[PDB]
Amino acid sequence: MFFLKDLSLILTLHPSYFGPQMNQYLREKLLTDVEGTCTGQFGYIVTVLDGMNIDVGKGRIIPGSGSAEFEVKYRAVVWKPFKGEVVDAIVSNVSPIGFFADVGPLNVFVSTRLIPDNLVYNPSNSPPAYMSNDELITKGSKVRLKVVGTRTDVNEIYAIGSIKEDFLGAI
């Protein structure tokens, strides 16, 4: 599920920053605009590999003002959940409607309707949990879930899923 896709970015640069160590500023600004972004198109941009040899190529000077346009071509480590995909994360929260889990930079939520019936939502328990004929789930506990659907959002991609199939749940 984690990938290493070869992307690129464009940054306009004011003439001020036209010093001797410019390569440097573009690079550091690159990072400020990529590492931490999130598009349903490309997923979660989390880390830029091989910094050192980043590629800048010559940049062109926009005619009106003075800025230079650079097409920085790098490569980075990303992660974007797919439907039907199966992974497991640490349970993060938990209400009457289900519980949310955290797989990496993500948060997938499981509905009380997407669990095995014999596992009911615990009333006054701390921290609020779920009881099975044998199992018990809370914040801490580790769960392996299946991502049914995915909703692309702001600068975060959340999704939903169930543990109603087999080989899913606690471990």
Binding site: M1, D6, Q41, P105, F167
Partner: protein, 159 residues
């Protein structure tokens, strides 16, 4: 923004089928993606832990030319100063290995379409009935895989 190395010409005409573990990943992740130098290159499967390394390595040769704990530190120096922390804790509380060799091994072995070769590596598994289930794309792409599944827990670095 930030566009990839797949510049198609979307001329006017709404054809992006659903995404499923039917091995039908977005058009941006086809078994055949294109290299920065203008070459053809196989996708890049990155099972957990193996991911945990690529990361730890770059954050390091980074804090080099720039001049649970042993990773929280290398962060607040070479990192923009949250998504990663999470992707690092998680990728470190679930990573299934430790040595760049023990990880090399898994790959020198397993290497199926990239997504699988990875899922099999980052997901615990015992039965084929199990793997073939949590990785529903297999099923007919390898007789009941069982050997391999063992050979993993056998190189399953201790914790």
């Amino acid at each position: 923004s930030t566009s990839t190395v797949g510049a198609r010409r979307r001329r006017a005409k709404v054809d992006d089928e659903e995404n499923a573990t039917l091995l039908r990943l977005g058009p941006e992740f086809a078994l055949k993606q294109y290299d920065h130098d203008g070459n053809e290159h196989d996708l890049i499967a990155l099972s957990l832990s193996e991911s945990r390394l690529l990361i730890r390595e770059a954050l390091k040769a980074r804090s080099r030319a720039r001049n649970e704990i042993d990773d929280d530190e290398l962060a607040k120096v070479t990192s923009g100063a949250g998504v990663v922390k999470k992707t690092l804790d998680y990728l470190n509380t679930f990573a299934r290995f430790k040595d760049e060799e023990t990880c090399t091994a898994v790959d020198q072995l397993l290497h199926l379409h990239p997504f699988e070769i990875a899922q099999l590596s980052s997901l615990g598994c015992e039965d084929v009935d199990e793997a073939i289930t949590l990785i529903p794309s297999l099923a007919a792409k390898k007789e009941v895989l069982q050997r391999i599944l063992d050979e993993l827990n056998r190189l399953e670095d201790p914790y």
